[PDB]
Amino acid sequence: TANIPNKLTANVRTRTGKGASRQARRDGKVPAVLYGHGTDPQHLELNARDFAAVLRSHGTNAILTLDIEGTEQLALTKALDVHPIRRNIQHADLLVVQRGEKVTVEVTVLVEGDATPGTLVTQDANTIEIEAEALSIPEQLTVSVEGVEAGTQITAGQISLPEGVNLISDPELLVVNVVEAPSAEALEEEGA
Amino acid sequence: MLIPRKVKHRKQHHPEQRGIASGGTSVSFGDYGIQALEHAYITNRQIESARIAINRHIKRGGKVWINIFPDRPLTKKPAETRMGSGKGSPEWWVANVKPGRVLFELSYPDEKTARDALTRAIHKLPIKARIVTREE
Amino acid sequence: MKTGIHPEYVDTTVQCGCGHSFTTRSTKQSGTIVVEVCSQCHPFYTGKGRVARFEKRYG
Amino acid sequence: KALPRLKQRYREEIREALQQEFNYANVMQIPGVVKVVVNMGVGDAARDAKLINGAINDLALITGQKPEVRRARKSIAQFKLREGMPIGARVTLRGDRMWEFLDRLISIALPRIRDFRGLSPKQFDGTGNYTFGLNEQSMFHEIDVDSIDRPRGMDITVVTTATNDAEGRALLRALGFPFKEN
Amino acid sequence: SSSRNGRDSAAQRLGVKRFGGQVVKAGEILVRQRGTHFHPGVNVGRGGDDTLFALAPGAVEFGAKRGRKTVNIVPVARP
Amino acid sequence: AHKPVGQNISEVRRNARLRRHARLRKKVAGTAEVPRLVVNRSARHIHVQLVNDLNGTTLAAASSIEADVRAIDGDKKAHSVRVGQLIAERAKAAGVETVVFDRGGYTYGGRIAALADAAREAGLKF
Amino acid sequence: DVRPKITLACEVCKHRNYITKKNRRNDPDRLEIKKFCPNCGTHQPHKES
RNA sequence: GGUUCCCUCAACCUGGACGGCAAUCAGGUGUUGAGUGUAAGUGCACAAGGGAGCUUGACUGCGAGACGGACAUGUCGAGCAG
Ligand SMILES: [Zn+2]
């Protein structure tokens, strides 16, 4: 997988703190940090509406290309600070990367397909860890439940991975659990 | 009704109702959830009344999770007595809920029935709440 | 080894009915003792009056 | 200027046999015996203290030295056992006196067992140590049948330098233990 | 009905009496405590009830020695 | 292959001695005026030192490794007496009059006591 | 009284110097002990009265 | 109680005549989860916990300097001599 990096304009902050971050967010901006093997963090500011557009389509682990006052940089989204209620982006950790480098990333797994009609599909693990190239991170991973019968454990070792992607988490994670659909009598005894 | 087997201290101070929730603000088990928006003590009777409303609506299939447990007791002194002479005996068990906390969860094949079943349960709770999903 | 608390110990001699003899130290005061079965006598090791009456009266 | 025949036999016969069978890298790895401990856990002496006197006297005759008098380190209601009372005895044997006791047990004591069928080779302890029990005290010539009062057995254990069970049997077999073919 | 509680004991006024940097005499009480939350150091002794008192004049200094909190007395120098 | 199961007697002996030597040092300590006399005893030799614990520096030292001590025709106890006399000569030369005996975590008696009694009549008092 | 108060008197001068408590079921006999006697000026055997 | 010296538990695994979840024996892992006369708290593995030998300081005349305090009470104390 080859991903064209997303271009985003970044400005170096002049004032940091909690009084300056609140004012920055009031102007449609998000504070950010750019650490990595550069080993000297840079305090940046990003457009709030432009950053959210990149995350909406290309996933949470989006590769970026920051224009830090005329200098091009390849960066990867490492973490996000989201308000529980207002559902904002209060911060963003950015990690510097270079082409041909391996990073450890959690990607999401999706469950597609319709199983036997007398079954209920329950997904235990939301995401699994991989180790792929910097510009070759899959946007999402998929599994298929088509004709799966009764009680089966679909494990993290049976997820079909693209080339150049290696599983990091142990191959015994119960990712998808397919079980018999509960009856009406089995509902009334759960949580009493 | 949910009741702890035992507690070290049977008479306790009231739980504080300040701040927002630190943990438990995301849907982990099911596909849909109910997220609180106000502070309240959710009694163990409103949880039973709210998870039977979900059971009736979805009938047979699906699974329901209750992420809050009524651990902390509240007392009530005998009726028609003056103030003083001790502290009342415990009578009901509550759960301290802060805004952002996710209370219930549900897994069901189709969406229209799932969101209707969870709405039937928000009307039994003494607070405002909203339906949230696993997606971002 | 403390002096006045241990049982009096004697160099002994073991004799068996098969002619096998030993020389060991034991607590037997006599300094000798006879055994009717030893390592060489026993069938389990070697793999090989009531019963004498079976061959006496009946034969 | 005297050696027990088991120690005499071990020095030049048993040691060389073990070297060829396992092919050690140094002569300091050759397995050997460390001590022999003889135990009689009465347990019924909690009902009458005079019971412990029988075990004390017998072990001095069988082994050749005075025992201890072990005391319970816990009070247990179901056994009516209170902490601090005699519950058993113990004798440890090292040096020469171990070699004679191992000699008399193998040569003399074991064959006198009525319906003797040897000792199981699975009684080993994890890392090359052996233990077994007896149901009586009548298999020893040092004790006399005239002065017996009631049956009472021992619990014989041998501690060896052997690393695991494989060398434990080899050292004991070459000593002449009657192990069943299992 | 009534309450079976309602007892308590007098406050014992424990704590640290001389803080770091204070100049003290000899025999002056530094810390009153139940156990050895603080351990005696140099020129400091332990009382019968685990009180810490100064064995020589100087200035108090709190330190640590192998994970143990200690109280030491340093000899301020004569003019 | 081979893999030892328990603890050797040398490993048990080493940690047990340092266990009961640190117990000793909770009382005795060295000062410039009253230095600490530390003794190390082995199956072959015996060593002594005169340590000042404020600086952690050694004032004087004698040992049985020296050629003069090796010339003695006696037994091990005879070597201790020679070493005990050689530490009172060097300590008093350095200007030391009183010391404290740190027996090193060994039982007092035999080679340790013979060294101390030889250094007591030679001038060092403790 | 299980633990009554007892007085220890010097053997020599018979002066009553010390007072203490002992269990009269565990120690049915008169307590014998060596304590300092101010009158004699030295440590002397003391006995219960 | 004073002093001198020595030691490390509880739990679990494995092997053992009565004997079992649990008595006494043996080997291994085990850093404090055991124990501290007596409630709780602060401490104690450096042991204040476990064992042994001798013993009476469970003294006489005193006490620099302090803690705490309406007052009367209460508490700690290096050091000097017998
Ligand atoms: Zn007198």
Torsion, CA A55, CA A59, CA A64, CA A69, rounded to 10: 10
For the beta carbon of residue A131, count every other beta carbon within 10 angstroms: 14
Q: Which residue is closest, via its CA, to the C1' of H66?
A: E28
CA distance G8 to G22: 11
* Three-state DSSP state, G18: strand
Which residues in chain F have their CB less than 8 angstroms from residue D127's CB?
5
| Tally of helices (H runs) and strands (E runs) in chain F | 4, 4
Q: Tokens for B19?
A: 């701040």
CA distance D84 to F16: 29
Cβ neighbours of residue B119 closer than 8 Å, sequence gap 6 or more: B131
Reference F113, options F21, F58, F39; nearest CA is F39
Report how many helices (DSSP H) and strands (DSSP E) chain G contains, helices first: 0, 4
How far does the centroid of ligand 1 lie from the alpha carbon of residue G48, in Å? 13
Measured between alpha carbons, how far is residue D160 from residues B47, D32, D155 in Å?
66, 5, 16
CB F5 to CB D163 under 8 A? Answer: yes
Contact D35, D114 (CB under 8 A): no
CB distance B81 to B44 below 8 Å: no
Q: Specify whether the CB–CB gap between D119 and D180 falls below 8 A.
A: yes
Instruction: Kindly write down the DSSP assignment for every residue of F71-112, as one continuous string.
Output: T--S-HHHHHHHHHHHHHHHHHHTT--B-EEE-TTS-SSTHH
* H-only helix segments in C1-59: 43-46, 50-53
Tokens representing A141? Answer: 């991973």
Distance, CA of G7 to CA of G19 (rounded, Å): 4
CA atoms of B127 and E3, how far apart (whole Å) = 36
Chain B nearest-CA residue for E5: B86
DSSP state of A37: T
Cα Rg of chain B, angstroms: 17
Q: How far is the CA of G15 from the centre of ligand 1 (A)?
A: 6
- The strands making up F57-63's β-sheet, listed across from edge to edge, are F57-63, F46-52, F36-41, F100-102
The continuous run of DSSP H or E covering F18 comes out as: helix F9-22
Spatial distance from the CA of F116 to the C1' of H2 (Å): 28
Q: CA angle, corner B128, sides to B123 and B131, nearest 5?
A: 80
The answer, for B3 touching chain A at a CB cutoff of 8 Å, is no
Question: If phi over 0 gives left and psi between -120 and 50 gives alpha, with beta otherwise, what is residue G34?
Answer: beta
Q: Cβ distance B102 to B25 under 8 Å?
A: yes
Q: Closest Cα to residue A118, out of A178, A182, A185, A181?
A: A181
Query: Rounded CA gap, D85 and D71, in Å?
Result: 5
Q: Rounded to an integer, what distance in angstroms lies between the CA atom of residue E35 and that of residue D11?
A: 60
- The residues, any chain, with a CB within 8 Å of residue D12's CB and separated by 6 or more, are none
Other Cβ atoms less than 10 A from the Cβ of A45: the count is 20
β-pair partners for B131: B34
CA-only gyration radius of chain G, Å: 11
Q: Are strands A102-112 and A141-144 parallel, antiparallel or unpaired?
A: parallel
Please check whether residue G17 is in contact with residue G8, taking contact to mean a CB–CB distance below 8 angstroms. yes
All residues at 6 or more sequence positions from F65 whose CB lies less than 8 Å from its CB, including other chains: F45, F47
For A90, A99, B1, D177, F69, the CA distances from A74, given in Å and listed in that order, are: 22, 9, 56, 76, 75
Task: Report the neighbours of B using a cutoff of 3 or more CB pairs below 8 angstroms.
Answer: A, E
- Helix, strand or coil for residue F116? helix
- Residue E36: nearest nucleotide (C-alpha to C1'): H43
Q: Is E53 in contact with E16 (CB distance < 8 Å)?
A: no
Report chain E residues touching chain B, CB-CB < 8 A. Answer: 1-3
CA nearest to D72, candidates D63, D58, D62, D82? D82
What's chain C's length in residues?
59
Q: How far is it, in rounded angstroms, from Cα B118 to Cα A80?
A: 29
| DSSP-derived secondary structure for A57-100 | HH-SS-EEEEEETTEEEEEEEEEEE--TTT----EEEEEE--TT
Pairing of strands B72-76, A152-155: unpaired
CA dihedral sign of residues D119, D124, D130, D133: negative
The DSSP result for B61-105, as a single string, is S-EEEE-----EEEEEPPSS--S-SS-PEEEEEEEEE-TT-EEEE
| Among D residues 113-132, those touching chain C with beta carbons less than 8 Å apart | 116-118
The answer to whether residue B87 neighbours chain E at the CB level (below 8 Å) is yes
> Would you call E51 helix, strand, or coil by DSSP?
coil
Considering only CB atoms, which chain E residues are within 8 Å of B86?
1-3
Q: Which domains can be identified in chain F, with CATH numbers? A: 27-126 (3.30.420.100)
For B85, nearest residue in chain E (alpha carbons): E2
B82 at interface of E, judged by CB pairs closer than 8 A = no
| Residue with token string 């080679």 | F111
Burial class (CB in 10 A: 0-12, 13-18, 19+), B29: middle
Q: Are F23 and F53 in contact (CB under 8 A)?
A: no
For A29, the 3-state DSSP assignment is: strand
Strand positions, DSSP E, chain A:
6-12, 29-35, 42-47, 63-68, 71-81, 91-96, 102-112, 119-123, 127-133, 141-144, 152-155, 166-167, 174-180
Is A15:A74 a contact under the CB 8 Å cutoff? no
- Residue E52's nearest nucleotide, by CA–C1', is H76
Using a CB-CB cut-off of 8 Å, the residues of chain F touching D164 are 5
CA-based end-to-end distance of chain G: 17
* Cα B17 from Cα B40, distance rounded (Å): 8
Phi, psi of D6 (to 5 degrees): -65, -45
For residue B25, what are its two tokens? 């603000």
| Cβ–Cβ < 8 Å for F102, F25 | yes
Query: What is the secondary structure of chain D as a DSSP string?
Result: ----HHHHHIIIIIHHHHHHHH--SSGGG---EEEEEEEEE--GGGT-GGGHHHHHHHHHHHHSS----EE-SS-BTTTTB-TTSEEEEEEEE-HHHHHHHHHHIIIIIGGGSTT---B-TT-B-SSS-EEEE-S-STT-SSS-STT--S----EEEEEE--SSHHHHHHHHHHHT--B---
Q: Is A64 within 8 Å of A76 (Cβ atoms)? A: yes
Instruction: Using alpha carbons, list the distances in angstroms from residue F54 to E32, E68, F34, F35.
Output: 29, 20, 11, 10
Q: What is the largest CA-CA distance in chain D?
A: 55
Q: What technique was this entry resolved by?
A: cryo-EM
What's chain E's length in residues? 79
F4: which chain D residues are within 8 Å (Cβ-Cβ)?
A: 163
A84: nearest CB among B21, B51, B64: B21
Helix/strand/coil for A20: helix
**Ligand 1 geometric centre to CA of G39 (Å):** 5
Chain H footprint bases within 7 A of protein beta carbons: 5-8, 10, 13-29, 41-44, 46-48, 55-60, 64-69, 75-78, 82
